[PDB]
From a paper:
Proteins attached to the surface of group A and group B streptococcal human pathogens that contain tandemly arrayed Rib domains have been associated with invasive infections and proposed as potential vaccine candidates. Here, we study Rib domains from Rib, R28, and from a surface protein from Lactobacillus acidophilus. Together, these 5 structures of homologous Rib domains, and further sequence analyses, show Rib is an example of domain atrophy, a rare event in domain structural evolution involving the loss of core secondary structure elements, and also reveal the remarkable structural malleability of this domain family. The structure, molecular dynamics simulations, and small angle X-ray scattering of a Rib domain pair suggest tandemly arrayed domains are likely to form an elongated rod on the bacterial cell surface, thus suggesting a possible mechanism of immune evasion mediated through domain number variation.
Thus, we solved the structure of “Rib Long” (RibL) (residues 1165 to 1268) and “Rib Standard” (RibS) (residues 1269 to 1329) at resolutions of 1.07 Å and 1.25 Å, respectively. RibS belongs to the “Rib” subfamily, giving a Cα rmsd value of 0.6 Å for superposition with both RibR and RibR28N, versus a Cα rmsd of 2.3 Å for RibL. As predicted, the Ig-fold D/E strands missing from RibR and R28N are also missing from RibS but are present in the RibL structure. Thus, RibL comprises a full Ig-like fold which likely represents the ancestral state of the Rib domain, and RibS is an example of evolutionarily recent domain atrophy from RibL; this is remarkable because there are very few cases where we have the structure of both atrophied and nonatrophied domains that are closely related in sequence. In the atrophy of the Ig-like RibL, a significant loss of the structure (∼20% compared to RibR/RibS) is involved, but the domains remain thermostable with melting temperatures (Tms) of 78 °C and 88 °C for RibL and RibS, respectively, and 71 °C for RibR.
Author numbering: 1269 to 1347
């Protein structure tokens, strides 16, 4: 009786951006090719990338069955 979250292991990928609005969360998973098609990506909470610095955020990976993983990443906002 397994869920998708029992089977798949998303990998964090740190990203770098210029100051700007919250980036595309798909950029924070480094092994999307390993995950089922129909897997969705969203930030748990929007990362504030409006100012420079190293931000911490979490990507919610939602599998086709509705189970989830939560993956923390660093977003390096440049000066």
């Amino acid at each position: 009786g397994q869920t998708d979250a029992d089977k798949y292991t998303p990998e964090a990928k740190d990203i770098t951006v210029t100051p700007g609005p919250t980036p595309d969360p798909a950029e924070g998973i480094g092994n999307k090719d390993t995950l089922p098609s129909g897997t969705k990506y969203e930030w748990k909470d929007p990362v504030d990338t409006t100012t420079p610095g190293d931000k911490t955020g979490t990507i919610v990976v939602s599998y086709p069955d509705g189970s989830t993983d939560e993956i923390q990443v660093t977003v390096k906002v440049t000066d």
